[PDB]
Amino acid sequence: AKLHDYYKDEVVKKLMTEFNYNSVMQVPRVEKITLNMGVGEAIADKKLLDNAAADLAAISGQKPLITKARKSVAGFKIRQGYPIGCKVTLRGERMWEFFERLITIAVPRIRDFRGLSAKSFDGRGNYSMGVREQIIFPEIDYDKVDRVRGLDITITTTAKSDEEGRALLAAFDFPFR
Amino acid sequence: MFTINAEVRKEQGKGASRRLRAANKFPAIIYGGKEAPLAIELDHDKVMNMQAKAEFYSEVLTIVVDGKEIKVKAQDVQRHPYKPKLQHIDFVRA
Amino acid sequence: EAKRLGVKRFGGESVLAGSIIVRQRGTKFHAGANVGCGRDHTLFAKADGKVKFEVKGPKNRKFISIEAE
Amino acid sequence: DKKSARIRRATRARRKLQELGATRLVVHRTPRHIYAQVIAPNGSEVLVAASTVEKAIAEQLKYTGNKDAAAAVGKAVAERALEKGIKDVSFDRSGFQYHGRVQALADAAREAGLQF
RNA sequence: UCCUCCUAAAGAGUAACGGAGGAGCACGAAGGUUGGCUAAUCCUGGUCGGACAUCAGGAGGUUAGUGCAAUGGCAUAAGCC
RNA sequence: CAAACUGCGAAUACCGGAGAAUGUUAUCACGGGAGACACACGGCGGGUGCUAACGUCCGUC
RNA sequence: UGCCUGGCGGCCGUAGCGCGGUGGUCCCACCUGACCCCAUGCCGAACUCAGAAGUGAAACGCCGUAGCGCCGAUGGUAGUGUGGGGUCUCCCCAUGCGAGAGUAGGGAACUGCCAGGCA
């Protein structure tokens, strides 16, 4: 709500001005945010998965659901039904506050900040990349760190093209490529 | 500019086709438009001589049947698998 | 042993209640009106009347219908 | 798509009722408006129908779509069915979830003097 | 001993010391009822990723799965909660 | 190109309802009396065999 | 009732797929909180409690496009029952039934009931 009001005040207006849209809701609208952890090392130890799920629940406003295996392959030695990871389906005030807290402090202070990529898209304007070094987030303190771990960050939007994603990045001011 | 001779058809069937082939003839049909399609019987040697020309692929055929001139075009032609004989031809009233 | 297969009763044939129409290994026909399907994928008549064959559905599947005389 | 999923969900009961060959009552639910009708066994005839959009039954309702409106529509449908002589129709809630306005209208129809 | 595909020639049945195979199982759930969901395969991004752990999106529409070897069928699912 | 291949698709065969016609009811059921229970050759559609057949076995006449 | 919209059936690629246009009069969809009706393998995920704050956009109805794709003749061809013949591995004679595919053509489908609105 706190960031949603400012979003509707300025981002919607600037996107409409730059894209000369006619429909009131032609501006892209955020659907949800997904925070998944596809480490793949859950086979060796199961406690790390629980610790990471607890950390995700603490940093977010909800407890992530566990995801089971999709397809078994003999090369990687993976069975069926064995839990591997979990994801957080951020929606509503929780997603708004989490995104605000991220974009406020967490994004600028990252080692080797080369800038986000504006071309890497799924194909319909959904930005689904991955970020390593989970220590960058403020909630993960040195008390609860276990190992250098990575995460996958995905933002879901009603948009169906990469131009809308570029417009959203421009609204987010897109520091550098 | 091309002369074509045609004969009326009064028989129908595989037996009729066999009779025509034995008598050194073969049938043909014309179809297209609102008019009902009709079958026309033609000889073998004269029709083969007519088809021997290289301009048949892009020429309008003037069928003379029952004292009437009809302009048609042969889109599809049926030929014997290996023997150099013709058993059936198709025409459209273009 | 050679398991019996085929259509016991075709269309337009009068049948009685409890009479099987076709005993099929799988499901090549589907029960319609007054037709029941057994546990062995066998269609049996649930009334008295004639049998009819019809094809319908998105996959053009066949159905068995019974009309009372 | 939501409408296609709802239709496919209701298709199970719709096909199951075909073998019975008995008249059924169905209700279409939407927050904007609610529709109701009683389908004949043939599946192409309706003995009676109503719509919340119509003021003839929406005149006493604060709006077309609400729990009280659904209850009133169900009561009216049940009364019209009883006066027409539906002869113990069945129930089919268009593949909905039986927890809200559909439950209220079903309860109203049952208390109106029905036995389904 | 039982069962599955041709032979067996568009009803059914139909044989040779003909051509080819699986079994002596199993359940107090792997059954029933009600409410819900819907595959193998590829691509996009991805410390770990070697193309082949899993993830978000797109195509695919049952070649997946449907316990045994096989056959007929199963999307309304007989597949899963 | 195909026997454990059909997005198509014959002839022919078989079932059931109605029907003029014919075959000494030629049809079916009941009870008694039976005979055989080692068929060969040819025609039609196939298998086995090496798409060597006039070798072999099937259903029908 | 002339037109538009939604539901209740058949028809199951003439109803399907690609592209463009149009739609808020009515209907439908987009919405936040959900501690309340309902509930989550987390999530209001689906459904549900207020309806227009506005819109017709993601989706959805309609029209055009015969582009992809589909149905599909007459005839012909392959084949086959009946009797015979030939140079009997197969073919032909008289007759009946008759393929597939392809061509012509078809078509952006149609039909019954209910409800609202535009007259």
Numbering used by the authors:
A (entry chain F): 1 to 177
B (entry chain V): 1 to 94
C (entry chain W): 13 to 81
D (entry chain O): 2 to 117
Which passages does the manuscript contain on this structure?
Separation of cellular extracts derived from cells exposed to Api137 in a sucrose gradient reveals elevated levels of partially assembled and not fully matured precursors of the 50S subunit (pre-50S).
To test this hypothesis and provide direct evidence of Api137’s ability to bind to the precursors, they were incubated for 20 minutes with 30 µmol/L Api137, representing a 100-fold excess relative to the ribosomal fraction. In contrast, the second Api137 binding site at the PET exit pore site was found occupied in the precursor states. After class identification, states were grouped into d126_(L22)-/(L29)-, C_(L22)-, C_(L22)- ~ H61, C_L22, C-CP_(L22)-, C-CP_(L22)- ~ H61, and C-CP_L22 classes, 50S and 70S classes, and pooled again to increase particle numbers with a specific organization at the PET exit pore site. An additional focused classification step was performed on the pooled classes with a fragmented or absent density for uL22, using a local mask on the uL22, Api137, and uL29 binding sites to ensure that uL22 was absent in all particles of this subset. In addition, both the (L22)- ~ H61 class and (L22)- class showed a less defined density for Api137, indicating that the peptide can bind even in the absence of uL22 but remains more flexible. In this context, it is noteworthy that states, even though lacking uL22 with the associated delay in domain IV folding, can advance and acquire the CP, fold the L1 stalk, i.e., develop nearly all structural features (in particular folding of domain V) without having finished domain IV (states 7-9). In contrast, the peptide was detected in most precursors at the recently discovered PET exit binding site. Interestingly, this site is in close proximity to the docking sites of the L-proteins uL22 (C-terminal region of Api137) and uL29 (N-terminal region). Since the incorporation of other L-proteins appears to be unaffected, it is possible that the presence of the peptide sterically hinders the incorporation of these proteins.
